Amino acid sequence: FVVKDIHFEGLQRVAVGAALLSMPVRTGDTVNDEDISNTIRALFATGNFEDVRVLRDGDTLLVQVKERPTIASITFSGNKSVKDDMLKQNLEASGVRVGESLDRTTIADIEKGLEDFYYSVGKYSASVKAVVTPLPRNRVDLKLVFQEGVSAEIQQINIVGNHAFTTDELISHFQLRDEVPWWNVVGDRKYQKQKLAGDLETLRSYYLDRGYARFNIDSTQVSLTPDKKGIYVTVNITEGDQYKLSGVEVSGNLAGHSAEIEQLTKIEPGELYNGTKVTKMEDDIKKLLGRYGYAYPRVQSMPEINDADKTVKLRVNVDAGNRFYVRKIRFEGNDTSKDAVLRREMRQMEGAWLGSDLVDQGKERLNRLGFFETVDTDTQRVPGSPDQVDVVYKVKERNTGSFNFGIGYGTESGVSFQAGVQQDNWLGTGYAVGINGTKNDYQTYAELSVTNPYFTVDGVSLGGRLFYNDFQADDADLSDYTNKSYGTDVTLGFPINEYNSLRAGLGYVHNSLSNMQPQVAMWRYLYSMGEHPSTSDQDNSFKTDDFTFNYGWTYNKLDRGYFPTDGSRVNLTGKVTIPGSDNEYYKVTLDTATYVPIDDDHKWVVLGRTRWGYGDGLGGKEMPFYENFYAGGSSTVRGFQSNTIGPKAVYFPKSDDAVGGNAMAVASLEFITPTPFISDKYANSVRTSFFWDMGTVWDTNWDSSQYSGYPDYSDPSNIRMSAGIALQWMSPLGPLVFSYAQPFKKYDGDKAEQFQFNIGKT
Amino acid sequence: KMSPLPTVENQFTPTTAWSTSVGSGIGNFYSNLHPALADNVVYAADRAGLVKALNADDGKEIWSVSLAEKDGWFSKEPALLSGGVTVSGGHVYIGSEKAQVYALNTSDGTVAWQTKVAGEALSRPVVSDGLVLIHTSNGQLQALNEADGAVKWTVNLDMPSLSLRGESAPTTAFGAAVVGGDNGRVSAVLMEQGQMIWQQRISQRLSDVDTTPVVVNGVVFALAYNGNLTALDLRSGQIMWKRELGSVNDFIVDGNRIYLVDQNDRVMALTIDGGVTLWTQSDLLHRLLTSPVLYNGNLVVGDSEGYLHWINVEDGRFVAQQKVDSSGFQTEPVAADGKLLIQAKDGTVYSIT
Amino acid sequence: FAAHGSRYHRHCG
Amino acid sequence: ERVVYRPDINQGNYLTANDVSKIRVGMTQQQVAYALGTPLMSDPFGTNTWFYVFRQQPGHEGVTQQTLTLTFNSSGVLTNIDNKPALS
Amino acid sequence: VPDNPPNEIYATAQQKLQDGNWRQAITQLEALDNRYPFGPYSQQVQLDLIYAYYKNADLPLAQAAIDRFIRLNPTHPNIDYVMYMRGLTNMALDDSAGVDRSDRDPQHARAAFSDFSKLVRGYPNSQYTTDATKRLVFLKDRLAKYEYSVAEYYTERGAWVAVVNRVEGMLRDYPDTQATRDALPLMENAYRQMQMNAQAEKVAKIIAANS
Amino acid sequence: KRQVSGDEAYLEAAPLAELHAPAGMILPVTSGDYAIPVTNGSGAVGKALDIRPP
Ligand SMILES: [Zn+2]
């Protein structure tokens, strides 16, 4: 047979010219059944068709073919466990995408791919089906239906071979969890291989930190329950004896700093081996070699062990490397935030010698802002220069605007509500604005604030606020009056060190008082101000306007933000009225908290707290009665009802109502011990303590000589005391703390409240 | 999904003879702990400890002892008894998850010897000519001399990346042991030193593990999860006939017929002479069943909902149904010397007429 | 005892 | 003033006595580059001059700067050297 | 969404594309392209699709359509139109809903400059060249202002090597722009601060010579 | 959002201006990458060009 022509049928989409180019045979060629078979198998090999059929017609080589149907629609059903976009990402494999061509023969591959995907999610019993429907013009649509099954969970975590420690102590630090109480927050019983590897390396570190130089992990097995609901984890370990440290030595390309490195490497004899100390020593060697301008200092250490003496000798090798210089720093991805907003956070200077630790800590500084989802870094050698590089940062922004709401309860103030909206990166400028409000039983508050974190390039900040307040005293168990106020402040921040900073600013406040119940302590102040209200009536009012100068200082070296075990925190604040205002007074406060561990494991610690306050008028006038100090309650002295400590009211026509005083002193001492009866797997999440409290409040201006029939409220000798027990943990509803204490030294007007608690943020 | 309970009329009314609780049960932990009977006394155990001996007839306690350590701030740690209870001679052998193997004398429960093995002992121990064989979680097979408790010989077996919880208890015939494996393989070892005689692959996620095997009249029968039932010669790993069945539960052979429970919880019958089915009883599907036993001319199978089903083997039809305990039944029943006993997922032990 | 606001506390002795 | 928590501000090439001491008159640009490293700035307005600057301002102290100016012939041969070890 | 022959599909689509909102004009276009991807209408459908995606502010889909067409048929007679539309598409990403936008990322402007340069170099006699030239002479100044801003930050930070290098690079790359003419006093100040008076005088001569 | 740029305006800015070289010195050599191509003729500018496809 000779090709007079080639005739096509069914080529509705695939080009006839493309097929004519694609066959191994052309017009005029001698053809047999072998060439016909080659043509049809080649057309099958093209992949555009599902059913190729060919024939030897009278005057042409006939090809009649149905092309592969084109998929025009993808739909899902029953997939609610996993996101539709996640399904779309998963189906990117195997050429399953809209607009392309496929066949029904590959459905099982999709089935098994989806099954494997949900197995990787942990849905070991999931099942999937597909339904396929064709359409004219050789179009086709498909739908996918999903059954999620049941997600497996970890049943037990077991360690065999340990003898030095109990298994619960080792389990307690792992990411995976086998027991989760309903009243605590410790995690979830999901299984992930990355978390398993992290737990394995944490277990290795836990033994390397205590002198077990010969520690090794033999094998690990993961087992599945026959119903495929539970997962079992078991690790095999073996540990030898503890080893002592005999000494260290260092050699290599030290580049002349050998004595300075050697003075850093010395360790006293008799200490146990410690991998954390070894790593810290080598990191300090890298840092010290890095401040001399080397870009990539490389160090390495291997331990030499002697099994006869149970001693380890440490060998360290150091390679200085070379010097590079930074030619340019570029940012990309910041399509909204200003360039300077990112460039401010860097620690590497452009046009200076490179520092790798500086680049990493600049990445961390940029990541701490929270404006970006992810941060990446790359160092690229500029072409044609042996020793110049460019540093490039990759960022992806996120929406910083949010609105938040909260609720809590406690004996101190009852039900509390919180609500507000905030925007941290206004127009990509770095400014922060927000509006906030709060309501308690006895107080209602609202404010609006604006803050510029960089008023000066060194970190000096500038901000202000505008507020409104509404305080009603009788609902707080005080003497009856009502105070509504508004004003505005402006303040500066000035950091001078990593741990402490200064503060200063100005402010204005306007006060309005009403419904004042007549009493001698209040009307002393009114007479001092020069007003003579009517003793028999309750319907008096008073107005004042003041300008104040504020300052402060804070010191904070605490070990960690939650459940600290070491450090101290001190805060001092002041206030004074500049001339031209109505009142003339000053006030100063100071409080202190410090932790002193008594155990090497930092599970037995001692806590001590204090609080002081003082204030008086400048001349002639007195401090207003609404600026007084208060004591008692869960915040100040446990065991006493809120605001009950101090002087008491004396009406004009004595009672348990407290009025507070213009001087205060409070002290406390507390012992923290491990919880006795919680299982060790999560015993560290609950803190239990015993305390001893004391404090007093007195009014320095009380003229005792004219009021012999009443106690002396100017005497600071009336010290109150109490002692008890308290405990706290993180509830699913939020932070939670309980207390029970009994006062063993009280006076006539003090009302006790033995059981106190608080739930959530208040 | 799980099928609802069937409706039947009972040709006889089984009743509880006596019941005695033994501490807590195995809980929700999957384990192999089950009671054992010999010489008209019954031994049971708890996961925390508390090995207890009870007389067969009255069910009253004879002696009790606890293996847990009892020192602390008013707290104690469990011993995690997962290995099954078997008795031979005057000793009682129980395994533990802490890699301990305990031997308690029958007279008073005092420990005779205690030996630490290479891993978690999960299979029920078997006793043969002074040696006890234990299949550990990490794939090691060890033999301990029953007199002193010392290790005799050890054989190492491969372990896949993922497997089913549980291990295959070996069986012994003609001085050589036969044991399954987690890699879908059956191996035979000589008893004295541990020389490997022959090995064969039975199976086709990719999980494929084995139960205990059984040997009769010179041929070896084996079964593998999601795999193939097979018949093997004792001389070598030659294969006669094969079918597409798989189960993690035990199976029983009698006369010329084989009874088993499918992993899909389907009861079936097969012939020894060839792989052909006699009848199929498929209505308890996806209810978590247990391995079957033969008692009083009937086939008795527990249910995880706490029901006990009686099946007639002549045609595969229900004959009875009973509710026993609300806790459920996971472990296998045991029947010997005219008695039938079972332990719930709770510590209660039942004696059934 | 009385329900002063939402808190429950002694207004008595 | 100086009291605020500034970072460290490094600028320019890093120089040492062992490196500056190796420079002799008549060496080529390639040898000078091998000895010290490529300079971060040079004269752009039409003279073959290289400026080496070593400036530091660490912590809570003042500035310290060293300069080293090298003048090269049109053939690429060093002809004059000028070392100023202290800031004016 | 009703099924129809393409003659009145395109008739109705074009009738509601020449005027009215784009939100329904797009919808019949993807329906026509999806159901009848191959046919006489293909090229016109693609070009109208690009126009609709651009004008409806669906910029990434417009990018995808242009990038598909430009290599699907690089021999089309009206390739300059698509090339200019890519230029417009890239230029449209450099602003958003004023505050000065110069400080932000300029990569889109750089891509737009390259795109318009390729257009004006490839097809001098095309009708779009005058507007392309105007857009790129705007883009040059926009690119210069970013380097000016960076130098103005470093002159406040107090790093003088960075300032002189930035201003020198700006002088090398954008020699004839208002940003460079306003930015060279920073170079003079940095030279005077590093006690390089011999160079400070030369920069002073330049600033004195040019107004 | 950002639909304003689809009807863009005010793209016209100040023209470019060359720098003069003082006596006895030279200016740095231009990179040449961002050099503006020279053109001839005239055409529509701004709104006067039709963006509608052919
Ligand atoms: Zn009250």
mmCIF file of N, CA and C in Angstrom, chain A residues 298-338:
data_model
loop_
_atom_site.group_PDB
_atom_site.id
_atom_site.type_symbol
_atom_site.label_atom_id
_atom_site.label_comp_id
_atom_site.label_asym_id
_atom_site.label_seq_id
_atom_site.Cartn_x
_atom_site.Cartn_y
_atom_site.Cartn_z
ATOM 1 N N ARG A 298 34.292 29.130 62.122
ATOM 2 C CA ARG A 298 33.856 27.747 62.227
ATOM 3 C C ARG A 298 34.631 27.057 63.338
ATOM 4 N N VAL A 299 33.906 26.449 64.278
ATOM 5 C CA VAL A 299 34.508 25.689 65.363
ATOM 6 C C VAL A 299 33.844 24.321 65.418
ATOM 7 N N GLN A 300 34.561 23.366 66.000
ATOM 8 C CA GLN A 300 34.078 21.998 66.100
ATOM 9 C C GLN A 300 34.708 21.354 67.325
ATOM 10 N N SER A 301 33.941 20.498 67.994
ATOM 11 C CA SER A 301 34.434 19.847 69.197
ATOM 12 C C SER A 301 33.947 18.408 69.240
ATOM 13 N N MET A 302 34.846 17.505 69.626
ATOM 14 C CA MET A 302 34.518 16.104 69.824
ATOM 15 C C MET A 302 35.059 15.665 71.180
ATOM 16 N N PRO A 303 34.320 14.855 71.927
ATOM 17 C CA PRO A 303 34.800 14.441 73.248
ATOM 18 C C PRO A 303 35.629 13.168 73.205
ATOM 19 N N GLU A 304 36.740 13.165 73.935
ATOM 20 C CA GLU A 304 37.563 11.978 74.119
ATOM 21 C C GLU A 304 37.304 11.437 75.518
ATOM 22 N N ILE A 305 36.891 10.176 75.599
ATOM 23 C CA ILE A 305 36.420 9.582 76.844
ATOM 24 C C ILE A 305 37.329 8.423 77.225
ATOM 25 N N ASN A 306 37.602 8.304 78.520
ATOM 26 C CA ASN A 306 38.365 7.194 79.073
ATOM 27 C C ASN A 306 37.435 6.413 79.993
ATOM 28 N N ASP A 307 37.203 5.142 79.663
ATOM 29 C CA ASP A 307 36.259 4.323 80.409
ATOM 30 C C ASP A 307 36.831 3.777 81.710
ATOM 31 N N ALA A 308 38.139 3.892 81.931
ATOM 32 C CA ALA A 308 38.714 3.406 83.180
ATOM 33 C C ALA A 308 38.502 4.404 84.312
ATOM 34 N N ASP A 309 38.841 5.669 84.078
ATOM 35 C CA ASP A 309 38.736 6.702 85.097
ATOM 36 C C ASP A 309 37.382 7.398 85.116
ATOM 37 N N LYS A 310 36.505 7.099 84.151
ATOM 38 C CA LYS A 310 35.223 7.790 83.975
ATOM 39 C C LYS A 310 35.430 9.298 83.840
ATOM 40 N N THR A 311 36.335 9.678 82.940
ATOM 41 C CA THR A 311 36.674 11.073 82.699
ATOM 42 C C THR A 311 36.638 11.357 81.205
ATOM 43 N N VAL A 312 36.325 12.603 80.862
ATOM 44 C CA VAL A 312 36.229 13.044 79.476
ATOM 45 C C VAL A 312 37.213 14.186 79.258
ATOM 46 N N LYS A 313 37.932 14.133 78.140
ATOM 47 C CA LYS A 313 38.854 15.184 77.731
ATOM 48 C C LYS A 313 38.337 15.810 76.445
ATOM 49 N N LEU A 314 38.192 17.131 76.444
ATOM 50 C CA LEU A 314 37.514 17.841 75.370
ATOM 51 C C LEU A 314 38.529 18.395 74.380
ATOM 52 N N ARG A 315 38.320 18.104 73.100
ATOM 53 C CA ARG A 315 39.172 18.590 72.023
ATOM 54 C C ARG A 315 38.378 19.555 71.157
ATOM 55 N N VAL A 316 38.950 20.729 70.895
ATOM 56 C CA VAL A 316 38.286 21.787 70.143
ATOM 57 C C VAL A 316 39.177 22.187 68.976
ATOM 58 N N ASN A 317 38.570 22.371 67.804
ATOM 59 C CA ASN A 317 39.277 22.819 66.613
ATOM 60 C C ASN A 317 38.595 24.066 66.072
ATOM 61 N N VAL A 318 39.397 25.061 65.690
ATOM 62 C CA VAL A 318 38.899 26.375 65.296
ATOM 63 C C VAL A 318 39.501 26.754 63.949
ATOM 64 N N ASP A 319 38.659 27.264 63.051
ATOM 65 C CA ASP A 319 39.082 27.769 61.746
ATOM 66 C C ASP A 319 38.549 29.187 61.597
ATOM 67 N N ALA A 320 39.458 30.160 61.496
ATOM 68 C CA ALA A 320 39.052 31.563 61.482
ATOM 69 C C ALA A 320 38.272 31.911 60.222
ATOM 70 N N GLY A 321 38.756 31.484 59.065
ATOM 71 C CA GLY A 321 38.079 31.776 57.812
ATOM 72 C C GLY A 321 38.669 32.994 57.130
ATOM 73 N N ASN A 322 37.799 33.891 56.672
ATOM 74 C CA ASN A 322 38.216 35.041 55.882
ATOM 75 C C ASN A 322 37.304 36.217 56.213
ATOM 76 N N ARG A 323 37.526 37.337 55.527
ATOM 77 C CA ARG A 323 36.771 38.563 55.750
ATOM 78 C C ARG A 323 36.003 38.953 54.495
ATOM 79 N N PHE A 324 34.734 39.310 54.679
ATOM 80 C CA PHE A 324 33.878 39.787 53.604
ATOM 81 C C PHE A 324 33.292 41.133 53.996
ATOM 82 N N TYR A 325 32.794 41.860 52.999
ATOM 83 C CA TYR A 325 32.229 43.185 53.211
ATOM 84 C C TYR A 325 30.872 43.285 52.531
ATOM 85 N N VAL A 326 29.934 43.957 53.192
ATOM 86 C CA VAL A 326 28.570 44.088 52.695
ATOM 87 C C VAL A 326 28.493 45.296 51.772
ATOM 88 N N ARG A 327 28.082 45.065 50.528
ATOM 89 C CA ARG A 327 27.967 46.136 49.549
ATOM 90 C C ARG A 327 26.587 46.776 49.527
ATOM 91 N N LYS A 328 25.533 46.015 49.816
ATOM 92 C CA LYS A 328 24.174 46.533 49.732
ATOM 93 C C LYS A 328 23.238 45.608 50.496
ATOM 94 N N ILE A 329 22.221 46.199 51.120
ATOM 95 C CA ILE A 329 21.144 45.461 51.769
ATOM 96 C C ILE A 329 19.841 45.828 51.078
ATOM 97 N N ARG A 330 19.108 44.819 50.618
ATOM 98 C CA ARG A 330 17.880 45.028 49.868
ATOM 99 C C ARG A 330 16.712 44.349 50.561
ATOM 100 N N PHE A 331 15.547 44.982 50.485
ATOM 101 C CA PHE A 331 14.300 44.430 50.986
ATOM 102 C C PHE A 331 13.342 44.239 49.824
ATOM 103 N N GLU A 332 12.577 43.155 49.863
ATOM 104 C CA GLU A 332 11.588 42.893 48.831
ATOM 105 C C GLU A 332 10.370 42.227 49.450
ATOM 106 N N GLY A 333 9.196 42.562 48.922
ATOM 107 C CA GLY A 333 7.940 42.094 49.459
ATOM 108 C C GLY A 333 7.183 43.117 50.278
ATOM 109 N N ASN A 334 7.816 44.234 50.634
ATOM 110 C CA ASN A 334 7.170 45.272 51.437
ATOM 111 C C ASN A 334 6.450 46.270 50.525
ATOM 112 N N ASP A 335 5.362 45.787 49.928
ATOM 113 C CA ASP A 335 4.566 46.619 49.036
ATOM 114 C C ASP A 335 3.690 47.629 49.768
ATOM 115 N N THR A 336 3.538 47.505 51.080
ATOM 116 C CA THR A 336 2.758 48.446 51.873
ATOM 117 C C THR A 336 3.581 49.175 52.921
ATOM 118 N N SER A 337 4.383 48.456 53.699
ATOM 119 C CA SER A 337 5.187 49.076 54.739
ATOM 120 C C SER A 337 6.347 49.855 54.135
ATOM 121 N N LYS A 338 6.643 51.002 54.738
ATOM 122 C CA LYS A 338 7.708 51.876 54.270
ATOM 123 C C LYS A 338 9.064 51.191 54.438
#
